Amino acid sequence: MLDAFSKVITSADGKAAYVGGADLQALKKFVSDGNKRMDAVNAIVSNASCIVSDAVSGMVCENPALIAPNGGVYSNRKMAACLRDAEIILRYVSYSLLSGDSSVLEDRCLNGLKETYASLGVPAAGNARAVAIMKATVNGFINNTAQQKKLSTPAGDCSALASEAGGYFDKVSSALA
């Protein structure tokens, strides 16, 4: 597994790892489809806020009781906690795609999450839909089929990377179901 970022992840203190030159050369030969992978990651990070807001907004628009009394995102505090979680999850997925594995996503983000949501009464159906919309949106951005905001890249195929990203969302889905 890629161990470039393990130190800054473990320290979790805002310190940054900068990977360039020979260290970036190495990284991009380590993981598969190196340069395409960086673009696939950018397809997520350059659209992070849109991905999150679209997913949570879709979750609500399909079931507006979610913003009514007793609803999972009734009150600004709950809506903001939900948007925060969606972004947390998305970023662990984006890091999984950058690093080429889901170890940090599983260990630091998902382990115990189902139980946490259960204790708080976070609605499973709404959560599953938010994740589903993020998955589909990320797929569109990776494949550059999004209708409004595209990313300029050299012509080619990122279907393997798209599937890999999908797989990471599936880990989130598995863990929460």
Binding site: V8, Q25, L27, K28, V41, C61, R77, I88, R91
Partner: protein
């Protein structure tokens, strides 16, 4: 178990192959990969009240 610090990896990608540099000096060697850099740090994902208020107001518009 999972962390409960609300922190997530923030990935920043830099492609400055057009030659336009930021105010700070290089923080890594560029040898072999001119103009490119991957930066990762762990940061708290802050609550964003404005975005929460907007979803409540605007969810019904795509």
């Amino acid at each position: 178990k999972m962390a409960t610090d609300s922190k997530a990896p923030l990935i920043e990608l830099f492609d400055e192959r057009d030659g336009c540099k930021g105010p700070a000096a290089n923080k890594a060697s560029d040898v072999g990969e001119p103009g490119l850099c991957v930066k990762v740090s762990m940061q708290k994902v802050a609550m964003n009240a404005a975005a929460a208020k907007s979803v409540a107001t605007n969810y019904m518009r795509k």
